[PDB]
A and B are shown apart, each in its own frame.
Chain A
Amino acid sequence: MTLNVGGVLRLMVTLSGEEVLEVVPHIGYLHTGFEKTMEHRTYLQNITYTPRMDYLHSFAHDLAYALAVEKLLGAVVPPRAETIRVILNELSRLASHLVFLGTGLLDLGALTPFFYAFRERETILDLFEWVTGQRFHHNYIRIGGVKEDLPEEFVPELKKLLEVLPHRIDEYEALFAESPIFYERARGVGVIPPEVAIDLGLTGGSLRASGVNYDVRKAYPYSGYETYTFDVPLGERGDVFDRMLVRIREMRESVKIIKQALERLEPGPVRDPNPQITPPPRHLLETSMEAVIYHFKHYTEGFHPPKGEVYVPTESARGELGYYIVSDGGSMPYRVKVRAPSFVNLQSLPYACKGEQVPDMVAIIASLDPVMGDVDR
């Protein structure tokens, strides 16, 4: 008896009885085709195309890409930019997570706790609007560093929210930890054998939720995470109960990265002053012929990175993420392969919920935290 159940994902769940014989997923419904259309844009222009895949923890795509390029032509990210980029990155982590957490607070009936998760997120998003002028898809990260400096109001407001979160995250851990129903709901279901997750590449930070200590910010450190006080949460046996919790723990360790980085924030530059890589200061466009030539040239046909191939792996709210850029010495990238954490993450969903019940199979996917934009792109 084959039923056809199909977020914007479709599932061919084959099932006689009440168990689950085999789930055969079908994706391609949000296939925008970023990887092709990006072979047809500037390096600067692609910074608008990265946030649009994982639109939830979007900043990680921004950063993952900017990283592979900066390496490629060799740019030096100013101290102040490096700092603002981790605050900004993790402030985006909480946004994605808060959502995964929120979608959980409803399967679980907890309602005032949810109406709060939404308010937190809205307060994170207003911060984004404060510095980037948008809720998302902020065109803020740059190959040099960042678009511009941050406004005066940003620090004081980040302090408010960074002040009420500390124990706030604990409160959520609490409701799920002291799991009234949640226990009988998630504890057994969704078996992730440590050594099979490492076969299907379920990097998803719901990998460590099944006893594997692999977070890329630790194993292959990048934007100066190399130098932060950093706890990588773990889960005992890879069920959904632990997956849900792992992600709540990750929220504190984010909040601590934030406080830590917020300290080492001294005034300075925000992007690499190299004329070849970064358009000239705005004010001398009325004076230097070179500036004008540089500025004009910069914004029309971009700059040209050397012939070569690069890959830097980064950690998102969904696992390994990183752009594989083949440069041909042009104004635009020759190939742009994006490592979708959410795409490999889903091969571990047929095994995830095999033989299990059925109405459970909702929470059995929600726990894999997939964003279709990421899988399909």
Chain B
Amino acid sequence: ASSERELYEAWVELLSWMREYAQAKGVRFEKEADFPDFIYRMERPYDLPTTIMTASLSDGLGEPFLLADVSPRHAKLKRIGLRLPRAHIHLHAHYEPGKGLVTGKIPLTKERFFALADRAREALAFA
């Protein structure tokens, strides 16, 4: 639907919280990868808000404790994902109309995100 555009809109903001929490708790924010559908888009049109497809919150060693990604514009079943690398925990945020960003039934607010990132930081970050 047009959800796709509002989901990408929500990808920007999740990224926004990442950069915030990052500067805030003074932990490396690392752009992990750009959309190949931008790099290799040629004369073709591109209206997406960012060019960053995989982000992360890494520690001092650079090993990440939080990984984030959304699926490209040309792939099916678009979801935005959150993974705690090393702790086996994966999340799948969709986008509902009126409700907003959900992990199924529970809304994914800044607050709830910050909670996860903290839990992760304290537990996982090697240095």
A292–B44 Cα distance when bound, in Å, is 17
Question: Is A285's CB within 8 Å of the partner chain B?
Answer: yes
Q: Which residues of A contact B41 (CB under 8 A)?
A: 286
Range, interface on chain A: under 10
Binary contact track B5-33/A, C-beta < 8 Å → 1, others 0: 00000000000000000000000000000
Question: Is B90's CB within 8 Å of the partner chain A?
Answer: no
How far does the Cβ of A255 sit from chain B's closest Cβ, in whole Å? 37
A287–B38 Cα distance when bound, in Å, is 11
Q: Which residues of A contact B36 (CB under 8 A)?
A: 286-287
Chain A contact residues: over half helix, strand or loop, or mixed? Answer: helix
Q: Which residues of A contact B42 (CB under 8 A)?
A: 282
Question: Is B4's CB within 8 Å of the partner chain A?
Answer: no
Question: Is A283's CB within 8 Å of the partner chain B?
Answer: yes
Q: Which residues of A contact B44 (CB under 8 A)?
A: 283, 286
A287–B44 Cα distance when bound, in Å, is 13
Range, interface on chain B: under 10
Q: Which residues of B contact A285 (CB under 8 A)?
A: 40
What is the chain A residue whose CB lies nearest that of B35? A286
Question: Is B74's CB within 8 Å of the partner chain A?
Answer: yes
A79–B44 Cα distance when bound, in Å, is 28
How far does the Cβ of A106 sit from chain B's closest Cβ, in whole Å? 47
What is the chain B residue whose CB lies nearest that of A286? B40
Binary contact track B64-107/A, C-beta < 8 Å → 1, others 0: 00000000101000000000000000000000000000000000
How far does the Cβ of A199 sit from chain B's closest Cβ, in whole Å? 57
Binary contact track A282-298/B, C-beta < 8 Å → 1, others 0: 11011100001000000
Q: Which residues of B contact A282 (CB under 8 A)?
A: 42
Binary contact track A269-291/B, C-beta < 8 Å → 1, others 0: 00000000000001101110000
A42–B31 Cα distance when bound, in Å, is 39
What is the chain A residue whose CB lies nearest that of B36? A286
A60–B48 Cα distance when bound, in Å, is 48
Q: Which residues of B contact A287 (CB under 8 A)?
A: 36-37, 72, 74
Q: Which residues of B contact A283 (CB under 8 A)?
A: 44
What is the chain B residue whose CB lies nearest that of A285? B40
How far does the Cβ of A290 sit from chain B's closest Cβ, in whole Å? 13
Q: Which residues of A contact B72 (CB under 8 A)?
A: 287
Binary contact track A227-242/B, C-beta < 8 Å → 1, others 0: 0000000000000000
How far does the Cβ of B45 sit from chain A's closest Cβ, in whole Å? 12
How far does the Cβ of B110 sit from chain A's closest Cβ, in whole Å? 32
How far does the Cβ of B43 sit from chain A's closest Cβ, in whole Å? 9
Q: Which residues of B contact A292 (CB under 8 A)?
A: 40
How far does the Cβ of B15 sit from chain A's closest Cβ, in whole Å? 21
What is the chain A residue whose CB lies nearest that of B44? A283
The 5 sampled A-B contact pairs (Cβ below 8 Å) are: A283-B44, A285-B40, A286-B44, A287-B72, A287-B74
Q: Using CB atoms and an 8 Å cutoff, list the residues of chain A in contact with chain B.
A: 282-283, 285-287, 292
Can you add 8 more A-B contacts, CB < 8 Å, to A286-B40, A286-B41, A287-B74? A282-B42, A286-B37, A286-B39, A286-B44, A286-B74, A287-B36, A287-B72, A292-B40
Minimum-distance CB pairs A-B, first 6: A286-B40, A286-B37, A285-B40, A287-B74, A286-B36, A286-B41
